[PDB]
Design a protein around this ligand. Structure first.
Ligand code: NDG
Ligand code: NDG
Ligand code: NDG
Ligand code: NAG
Ligand code: NAG
Ligand code: NAG
Ligand code: ZN
Ligand code: ZN
Ligand code: ZN
Ligand code: ZN
Ligand code: ZN
Ligand code: ZN
Ligand code: ZN
Lengths: 390, 390, 390
């Protein structure tokens, strides 16, 4: 029959308002405030956390403050292991109320909520990002959110910790928690290597032209939303590749210029004309490597016929010292994918190459280059096949 | 007086939490999951639907599963007619509770909710997209959401069906249901016809240059959000025009290049100089044709002085074989409008035309062309006059 | 201990569902409908307002309609003063219920809600944009929203009024109230002054080339979201500068062309070659002037090392009459900042300048220029340092 949830005679239940809050959170779970480690109250038998608020699949969880320590987690028996400190909801448990709403003594022992240590495979099997209490096909009764990597040493020592920032709704994303900017950078200058195909380093280090003969590796300002993307964990690809953490339709914006651009000089033999040199800037996705996503999670497989390379800018050098470009595209990206940008040109400097024979500031380079990568759409349901291949 | 809705002494009512959920849905109604046709349980007297959840102006509606058929709709008396299967809320009806919250026997016969067949004019007069239960000026008591076009044949046959995808929040738009991408495509190549003004086909078929003498009509990947736009229903305009289904401020992104671009060759007579040829890429809106929107709904009239054409790219060919371009603009668009892109240049190939005299790959063409159209703002209230004219 | 807010045994309270609605409003407070001044029912002793709905930090407030006047505010004692008409929540007050939910006589005198006159410093000390009832560090019990500037004259006269549009969620922003477009314009043409550095007027008046010898100040269509930005209040900077009203990561899109672009003519002395002229289009932020934000509010100080200028387009003129450009960047902006766009080139017209020696349509100018400024991210928490410097 046709059931009303929110109507005059309806009883509005707890799964109901939690389903509403989840919708209001754009189906994102995470710590809204606090819940960071309290090292001062952390011993070799206990792990302390500060007060705060989290939302886990629409269920509001609070660590209350008083007097500190705001909360204590038992670390007895944990040694020489890397574990995940998790906030878990277990709907098989019973919340025990006591006292009364008549006197001012009503309290609940929320046994459905736990702060616990899990290993990586156990967390993954019940991770909120892959499984749901509200799921249609495979509904779960137990769901977790990892807060910290906790590395326990020998018996009698305090452990080492690393915050799981993808699970904290810290800042930059309030209002649109599941979307917004994935990555962005300030303008940078990057020397073009004398090769046909090369990646443009988008992870905060560029090969900056500094003199007429030299370039040097130089940091530039970059930001990444850890919920959406991360720098590649393999050092070979760390300067260039992002790992996508969340499926979706993403917008890629690029702008900059090609400085000291090569071209065939106008001479009597070519009827005093500039001989343009072809170049292209491409964005690329690659999913050949599995388990690149956070916790080594299984990648989300793309639909059959998915794109791998897309031309953002494709043209010839125009005979000017510096030529600007700009491009905006929407592209599908999948959890576990690598994403990168490439500069492509010919290798014959006297015939087809956009680059010259110089080095540093005397050599062809990208100048004032910047990008923004933003999540603008999801790939749930039918969108996976209809929108996911490009 | 000043009334509190959510305060300590307030009674939080059913219209209240439904007004809250509607706000949380960005004022969009639609099926959240399931509610698709069940052909196996569909006869000549009954129409079956699978279980699911919908939100209609903040009211949560559920079709419950058990044992199937999840729900049955009486089709007796319906023959040789095209009807709309609708989910309707009727606040004039009474929801009948039975049993008690003390025993575990509390139930409700939700007479305020109906699954019914309506003709197009009846649905339009009570369509959620144009009328509201929460409306300020004209509050309604009955509101509907169309789910399927149902075409009944002769008495004794099962009917034909077509899903109304604009009313299903399927995928791509979760989190931002009333906004996001309206249309997008992968890069395509399109031959420039030897005319002053022509539309660029944005609907999935381009005239692709394939040889030195020929081009051929070729499909390219395209996606449209049916809630925001649709391909023009008239075959004359189907390759080029979109029909806007929702008022708003939209962002249009375009990028690509003009390949085999024409220019006056540098000769002794012109002092060995390239004679550039002017071209422009424009986006256009046209509202002369009424009833192009879904169901033949009345178009939303634009404010006095509304734009019709906007230059995205306006420049000269630079003497290169291929020249890239990019542009981003925000534009106002109205339900019922046609939206299209045009390429504009002179017609004299030896004087003012950006195109040459060649055909296929030897002729001037758009290369690596793509676009994204996205809804970024609404046109409610004062914005209609202040933001709606451009 | 671990407390559940939304669980089976939880009591869902009034601060709770107000915290939920605030989250659903993207932490924006404002009038959702009505609440505009009623001049017909306004005397020298009373100020009338029409019915409507507002949300103040998740608390729903309603002015009920009946018979009008929908509400009356006592103006006795107010004279020769500019005041702010404010809607205030005071949690120190007691809401007085009467009657019963058994009979149909339950009513509340909401003493926690006031419509009052405050001076600018008092409103600022309890303004919802800077302080919160739900605040972590400094929780408040009293919070206000300014609705109108009210200027009272001599005793016996009706006052003058000006709506505070930043506090009305009127239109353009429903669905994403705290984000969306900040400013946008239609295409305009603007004469380039014969100077090294100049601002591009983004506030609705351009110096339009009209003849071969003259340009004239001409209005063009522009829109600003008053919640996000405003035209500079100082006349010296009014044609060019925006004042940012809300911290965040903003997206700036620009497009247009440089028409009648200057270049060194190809002659036998330069081997029949175009001598390109460097130019750049930059966006800029400046926070040297305090109190530019609405009500003269204190500016939000940017993190150490914040950017001030960013190149959007940097290249040489290519020897064409008209050359197009486009650029998209994300930038951090702070409440109280000035934001503007600049055109930068050399001043020697025979050597390094992108501009020529002509005037009006015979002189170098921006053609088909437009922009969109959009709020795309916040700068709360860690994002302030990680994302706020660029
Ligand atoms: C299995 C493996 O290491 N594959 C890598 C892939 O991860 C990476 O994205 C790509 C970059 O060009 O190179 C290889 O394909
Ligand atoms: C009444 C009618 O058919 N008008 C059409 C309009 O629908 C369409 O948008 C336009 C395309 O250029 O051509 C005409 O104006
Ligand atoms: C204190 C003062 O008036 N400073 C102004 C600043 O407000 C403005 O943004 C800038 C524009 O270039 O000029 C000055 O710096
Ligand atoms: C041919 C090519 O693209 N080579 C890239 C190189 O530019 C990049 O620096 C390196 C690390 O990402 O990976 C290679 O695959
Ligand atoms: C002069 C002009 O713009 N002609 C267009 C044509 O390019 C387009 O293919 C056709 C169908 O959309 O409609 C015409 O109006
Ligand atoms: C050198 C420079 O940038 N001058 C600008 C000028 O172009 C602008 O018209 C005026 C008002 O905004 O402010 C000046 O600072
Ligand atoms: Zn649910
Ligand atoms: Zn996953
Ligand atoms: Zn956006
Ligand atoms: Zn309502
Ligand atoms: Zn309509
Ligand atoms: Zn709160
Ligand atoms: Zn402030």
């Amino acid at each position: 029959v046709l059931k009303g949830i929110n109507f005059d005679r309806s009883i509005v239940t707890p799964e109901n308002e939690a389903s509403i809050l989840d919708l209001a959170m754009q189906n994102r779970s995470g710590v809204l405030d606090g819940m960071t480690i309290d090292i001062l109250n952390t011993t070799s038998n206990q792990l302390a956390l500060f007060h705060g608020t989290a939302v886990l699949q629409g269920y509001g969880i609070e660590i209350t403050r008083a007097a500190a320590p705001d909360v204590l987690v038992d670390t007895t028996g944990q040694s020489n292991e890397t574990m995940l400190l998790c906030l878990t909801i277990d709907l098989n448990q019973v919340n025990v109320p006591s006292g009364t709403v008549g006197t001012n003594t009503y309290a609940v022992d929320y046994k459905q909520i736990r702060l616990e240590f899990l290993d990586v495979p156990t967390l993954l099997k019940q991770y909120w990002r892959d499984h749901s209490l509200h799921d249609l096909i495979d509904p779960r009764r137990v769901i977790s959110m990892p807060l910290y990597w906790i590395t326990f040493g020998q018996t009698g020592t305090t452990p080492l910790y690393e915050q799981i920032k993808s699970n904290y709704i810290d800042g930059g994303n309030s209002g649109n928690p599941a979307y917004g900017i994935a990555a962005r950078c300030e303008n940078f200058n990057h020397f073009i290597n004398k090769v046909a195909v090369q990646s443009i380093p988008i992870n905060g280090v560029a090969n900056r032209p500094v003199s007429s003969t030299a370039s040097q590796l130089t940091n530039y300002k970059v930001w990444r939303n850890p919920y959406l993307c991360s720098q590649d964990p393999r050092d070979k690809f760390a300067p260039d590749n992002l790992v996508i953490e969340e499926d979706g339709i993403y917008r890629i914006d690029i702008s900059g210029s090609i400085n000291i651009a090569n071209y065939t000089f106008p001479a009597s033999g070519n009827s005093w004309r500039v001989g343009g040199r072809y170049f292209q800037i491409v964005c690329a996705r690659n999913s050949s490597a599995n388990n690149l996503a956070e916790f080594g999670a299984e990648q989300h497989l793309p639909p059959s016929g998915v794109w791998t390379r897309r031309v953002l800018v494709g043209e010839y050098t125009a005979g000017m010292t510096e030529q600007a470009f700009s491009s905006v595209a929407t592209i599908s990206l999948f959890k576990g994918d690598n994403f990168f940008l490439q500069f492509e040109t010919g290798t014959n400097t006297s015939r087809d190459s956009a680059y010259n024979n110089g080095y540093g500031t005397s050599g062809t380079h990208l100048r004032n280059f910047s990008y923004t990568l933003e999540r603008v759409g999801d790939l749930n349901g039918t969108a996976y096949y209809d929108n996911g291949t490009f």
